[model samples]
Target: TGANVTFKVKGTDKEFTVFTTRPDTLFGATFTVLAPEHELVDAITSSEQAEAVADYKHQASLKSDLVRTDLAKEKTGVWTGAYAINPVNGKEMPIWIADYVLASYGTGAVMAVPAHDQRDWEFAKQFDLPIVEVLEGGNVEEAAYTEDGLHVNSDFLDGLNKEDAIAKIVASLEEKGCGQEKV
Candidate 1:
């Protein structure tokens, strides 16, 4: 793992959990796309895309109905020059700004799942990036069906399905003193 920051609200004892499924591909997280309307956007937008991003935000704000009605493909956002350090790898992944992700979703910023997730697949296709398959369930060339099969690119889990892979990886992590079982 790497340095991670956790913040607790001042008045509540509430806590949240965030985890990435593709911890093995943490190094490939080239960017961290956040919802443009996220509360933290104002603090993170880069100077280069600030103007356009601001304008986009303004337009989005005006069309609350339109924004809410648009399909996933129609949704878009500006980039926030900010980047997040992958916990598994020490790579600096740019934090892009997008609307496809809801603020309430896992961490607001998702590790792009171009291969297994439809939304991310569309996003990557739109941006023209290479999509690599890490799981070995179905025909990756067709679509990402996160069922179960021998893991492909994954190291120790190369021959396990979703359940077995998870167990194996977690066990390995625990053995290495990098993880623990939670109830």
Candidate 2:
């Protein structure tokens, strides 16, 4: 979707904008993944992760587009000192810098709904991040459904399918003055 969104970098007042396709799976979000070249990568990073994050970003820089594209299958990233907060659900998500999230497409950032998105799922599994099932019908234990399903853990959008759920959440965002559009 590449929709620009305001996000609070948890543990600090640091705020930023990112892009996401399924704001509907917000509650299930466990972290925020950003491209290595993203400017915020350094700003929000904690001192401890700073050293490691720099190394990771440098490695990512040395790779070509083909390598970057291939790496998404087995995604890798370094944790930032700061985490991200899902405004819709109040979930705190880790902030990471990975090779796959390129800066040209969106905000160089992505909301990771591990249970619903395959890329996020693979990364989460590799890093042992918490995975929450938001869409009913398929078990996240197996893989990301990536299909329209009844909303499970989504509160107001719970019983709704993907279309309806996204509508409501998007509307909520707009009403709150968080008009989503571009990065």
Model 2 stretches with alpha carbons more than 4 Å out: 71-73, 179-183
* Per-residue alpha-carbon lDDT of candidate 2 for residues 16-42, written as tens digits (9 for 90 to 100): 777777777877877888888988888
| Tens digit of per-residue lDDT, candidate 1, span 97-183 | 666665665555466656666666666666654465766556644665445445666556566666666666556555654443433
Score residue 102 of candidate 2 by CA lDDT: 83
- Candidate 1 ranges with C-alpha deviation above 4 Å: 1-30, 62-72, 138-146, 155-157, 167-183
Highest TM-score among the candidates is held by which one? 2
**Clashing pairs in model 1?**
none
Best by lDDT: 2
